[PDB]
Each structure stands twice: as structure tokens, then as C-alpha cells.
């Protein structure tokens, strides 16, 4: 039931920015988290798992880390295909918490 | 390829239940735990619970015990989720995606993650609307 | 707070079926039974203790059961 | 100083009784089965009516 | 719903002091006093019972203590 | 035939209890507060300061 506070609510950025999002567990997740970017109503886009590691098929812009319970994703550039719903997600103890979400908008 | 594709979306009355579909194509059925996330409009997504598609076995979430019960089909590889005593908070969009080290049942917490922990299969959801 | 006077003590006889005595009659034997099956070494230490006891060979029983009734309850 | 209420003891005086007679009580009132009573009875106003 | 296990049974004995112990080191002794302050011909009973076995005269002793906290307890 | 409920046995597995240890909560980290541990202990590394 650990709750995963999501830091901030909603962004906007120009093209080519580096930006970086927070998420915060009341309790200790180590390395137990994983990110999302979520397009309004379609099959999403692939972010981050184990909260330090990419995927393949994944572009390089995207990062993550975090080693306690603070988790900093970060995208070194923004680009307009990287408008989305920002998610993270628990993944100890089994009452799997998601994040409140933080979206972007292009400037 | 390694997809979950689910069934329509659902126009409910409140009191009734609905049911949700979700079947596997590319990989071995009974490998991969499926999981259900709702999430509402106005809100973020909401883990549901899991089922293994290899002997049923369910668990779910403390906000919805005696509420959703999850059901297989080894032939059709084919995940069923219904959901039992619906309410106009029940409005939702329900995903269902995978999750590995699927060896035997339950959860598998400890173990490893990641890698599509569930976030590859999802497809394209099902909208639930609980109306008159 | 331990409340001692269990009523069997002073329990009514009559015609009906008592409060709880279809539950009552079998609860101090299964009680000595789960307290034998947990500790069943105390059943050979209880042998060694009451065959040193009375030498009479069927005394020694009767200090057996004696003994591993006591252990379960009063202990 | 660990301060404990020591709760509710509904059920350890549950188990407590296991001699005990259930009766019933309504305004008060209170109706009581399993009762015994030596009531001795009296013949020679009984009569077979109409034999 | 007789809540057997006695957790006394597997009592852990840390340097703290346990969940009631102060109130359980005296707890089984008077609920055998206020047993036979409520019964007290059994005692004349047990005593007609202890004297029958043993004869040994420091054995009937032993069968008083056996019987007399066999009876609050285990009965 | 009627049923009965026994009612709350809060108190009595209280009393059942006598024996264990307490501890505590913190969020999800269960904090005890009793046990012990044996150590071997390197003092090799040590310095006075103030020779």
C-alpha cells in the first residue's frame, strides 16, 4: 500500500530541453520501480524498468535513477513526439501503486 | 508478435458485472502473469490484480476483494476478468499486461522483474461505462 | 484477567442442553493432546520421573497420568 | 510505561461458562426454560365426561 | 473458541519483561486457592483418594499435590 | 435449533498471549524491541587522539 508521490503535476517544455521528474515512496522500494509515459488513450511508449535500465527498442533520451526511495527519470532532449501521461510504479509488497501522473505540452 | 489483445468496449447497469477478455498471441500462455489495471478518466492508472494463466490462481487489490474474479482458458489462452457489483466509480478504461518469472503461481515479489515487468502487452484496453 | 471460574466447576444437570457442554466434552482431552504432540519429549522425561516413583508397576501409570495431565493445565 | 486497555473479555467469559442455562428476558420479564417443578397432582375431581 | 494454546507454553525469556508476566506468575496458584476455597470437601476426598495409593507416606503427598491440581485445572 | 454468536475473544486471546514480546510499527518496518546478537569485534583500527 506504499504510497509513490509523484513530483510535479504537469510540465511544458520546448523542443530539445532536458527535464527530470521525482518520485518519492514513503518506504523503501530499492530498486523496485519502473517508469511509464502514457499518449492519451492509445498503446503507450516505453520508458524505464528496475528504475536505472532502458529497453530495447527504447530511444537513448531517456534515463532513470534512484537508489533509496528518491527516483529522478530524466529526459536529456524533449522532442514533440515525447507529449505524454508520466507515470512510476511500485513494485514491492503487492499493493502496486502507480504515481498520480505528470504530463507535458509542447511549446 | 508478443501482444495481449482484449475484447470491446462495455455498457453496464450499476449492480451487474461485467466481463473483459484478454488473449495472448507470440509467446507461451502460460509463462507470463496477467495483471489488470483500471484507470479512470480523471484519474491515473489503479492495479486491479493478477491472475496466472497457468492454474487460475488469483489475488487482487484490498479495494476490490469480493469484487473481480479472474478466470483462464488454456485452450483459447484467453484471461476473463469480471467484475462483480458494479458502481458509476467503475467507469473506467481496464488494461491487462504480462509481468515474467511466471514459473509457478501467485505473485513472485523477490524474485526478478522488469523487462515488460507488464509494460509490452496492453494493446488496446476496454472502456467499461456503468450507466443507465 | 484470567477468568479462573470456568462454570463447569458448578454446572447445572437439568433436562436441556447446557450452555456449551457439545463443545465442553472433549476440550481438556484435545487441549492435553495438542500439548503432547508440541512437547513429546516431556512424555519421556515423565517416564523416566514417575518409573522412579512408587515401584509397584502399575502405580508408575497412574503416576504417568498424573503427571502428563498436569503438565497441559495447572502448568 | 506500555499502557494496554486489555480490550474485551466477551469471549473469555463465553468460554468461562460451560454450565450455564440460557433463558430469555423481554420487558423484563425474564422466561426461563429448563426448569423442574414437583407438582403433586390431585385425583376425585376428574370425571370421564359421559361415559 | 476455548483459546488453548496458553502462549506460556513458548514463553520467550529476553531480557525484557514479557506481555504479562507479572500477572502470570501468580495466576495459576490462586485460581487453584479459589477452587478449594469453593470446594473444600474434595480435599477430604482426595485425601481418602491419595492415602488408598501408594503406601508409602511421602507418596501420599505427591498423589494430594497430583490430584488437588488435577481437579481446578484439567477438570 | 438456534445459533449463537460466541462474541468478541479479543480479551481472552490476551490473556492467551501471555508470553509473547511486543513491538511496534513504523509504516511497514516492524520494530522490535527486544533480542539479542553475538558479535566478534575488531578493535584493530583504533587510535587514542590524545597521546
Known amino acids: 500500500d506504499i504510497q509513490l508521490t509523484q513530483s510535479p503535476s504537469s510540465l511544458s517544455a520546448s523542443v530539445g530541453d532536458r527535464v527530470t521528474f521525482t518520485c518519492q515512496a514513503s518506504?523503501?522500494?530499492?530498486?523496485?520501480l519502473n517508469w511509464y509515459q502514457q499518449k492519451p488513450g492509445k498503446a503507450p511508449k516505453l520508458l524505464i524498468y528496475?528504475?536505472?535500465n532502458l529497453k530495447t527498442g527504447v530511444p537513448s533520451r531517456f534515463s532513470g535513477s534512484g537508489s533509496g526511495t528518491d527516483f529522478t527519470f530524466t529526459i536529456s532532449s524533449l522532442q514533440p513526439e515525447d507529449v505524454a501521461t508520466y507515470y512510476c510504479?511500485?513494485?514491492?509488497?503487492?499493493?502496486?501503486?502507480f504515481g498520480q501522473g505528470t504530463r507535458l505540452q509542447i511549446k | 508478435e508478443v501482444q495481449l489483445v482484449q475484447s470491446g468496449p462495455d455498457v453496464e447497469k450499476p449492480g451487474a458485472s461485467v466481463k473483459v477478455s484478454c488473449k495472448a498471441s507470440?509467446?507461451?500462455?502460460?509463462?507470463?502473469?496477467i495483471h489488470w489495471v483500471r484507470q479512470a478518466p480523471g484519474q491515473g492508472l489503479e492495479w486491479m490484480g493478477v491472475?496466472?494463466?497457468?492454474?487460475?490462481?488469483?489475488a487482487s487489490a484490498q479495494k476490490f476483494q469480493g469484487r473481480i474474479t479472474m478466470t483462464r482458458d488454456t485452450s483459447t489462452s484467453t484471461v476473463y476478468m469480471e467484475l462483480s457489483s458494479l458502481r458509476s466509480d467503475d467507469t473506467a478504461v481496464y488494461y491487462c499486461?504480462?509481468?515474467?518469472?511466471?514459473?509457478?503461481?501467485?505473485?513472485?515479489?523477490?524474485?526478478?522483474?522488469?523487462?515488460?515487468?507488464?509494460?509490452?502487452?496492453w494493446g488496446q484496453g476496454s472502456l467499461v461505462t456503468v450507466s443507465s | 484477567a484470567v477468568t479462573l471460574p470456568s462454570h463447569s466447576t458448578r454446572k447445572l444437570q437439568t433436562r436441556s442442553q447446557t450452555w456449551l457442554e457439545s463443545r465442553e466434552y472433549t476440550k481438556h482431552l484435545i487441549r492435553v493432546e495438542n500439548w503432547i504432540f508440541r512437547n513429546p519429549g516431556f512424555a519421556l522425561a515423565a517416564a523416566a520421573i514417575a518409573w522412579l516413583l512408587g515401584s509397584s508397576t502399575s502405580q508408575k501409570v497412574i503416576y504417568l497420568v498424573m503427571i502428563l495431565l498436569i503438565a497441559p493445565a495447572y502448568s | 510505561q506500555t499502557v494496554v486497555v486489555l480490550g474485551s473479555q466477551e469471549g473469555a467469559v463465553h468460554t468461562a461458562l460451560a454450565g450455564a442455562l440460557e433463558a430469555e428476558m423481554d420487558g423484563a420479564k425474564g422466561r426461563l426454560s429448563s426448569g423442574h417443578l414437583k407438582c403433586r397432582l390431585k385425583m376425585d375431581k376428574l370425571r370421564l365426561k359421559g361415559v | 473458541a476455548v483459546t488453548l494454546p496458553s502462549h506460556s507454553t513458548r514463553k520467550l525469556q529476553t531480557r525484557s519483561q514479557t506481555w504479562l508476566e507479572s500477572r502470570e506468575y501468580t495466576k495459576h496458584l490462586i485460581r487453584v486457592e479459589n477452587w478449594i476455597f469453593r470446594n473444600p470437601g474434595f480435599a477430604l476426598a482426595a485425601a481418602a483418594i491419595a492415602w488408598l495409593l501408594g503406601s508409602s507416606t511421602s507418596q501420599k503427598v505427591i498423589y494430594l499435590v497430583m490430584i488437588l491440581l488435577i481437579a481446578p485445572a484439567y477438570s | 435449533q438456534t445459533v449463537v454468536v460466541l462474541g468478541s475473544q479479543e480479551g481472552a486471546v490476551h490473556t492467551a498471549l501471555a508470553g509473547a514480546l511486543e513491538a511496534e510499527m513504523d509504516g511497514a518496518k516492524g520494530r522490535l524491541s527486544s533480542g539479542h546478537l553475538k558479535c566478534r569485534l575488531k578493535m584493530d583500527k583504533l587510535r587514542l587522539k590524545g597521546v
Open positions: 499486461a504480462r509481468g515474467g518469472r511466471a514459473l509457478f503461481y501467485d505473485s513472485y515479489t523477490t524474485p526478478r522483474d522488469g523487462g515488460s515487468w507488464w509494460f509490452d502487452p
Open positions: 507470440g509467446y507461451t500462455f502460460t509463462s507470463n502473469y
Open positions: 491472475i496466472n494463466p497457468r492454474g487460475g490462481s488469483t
Open positions: 518506504q523503501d522500494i530499492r530498486k523496485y
Open positions: 528496475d528504475a536505472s
Open positions: 510504479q511500485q513494485f514491492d509488497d503487492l499493493p502496486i501503486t
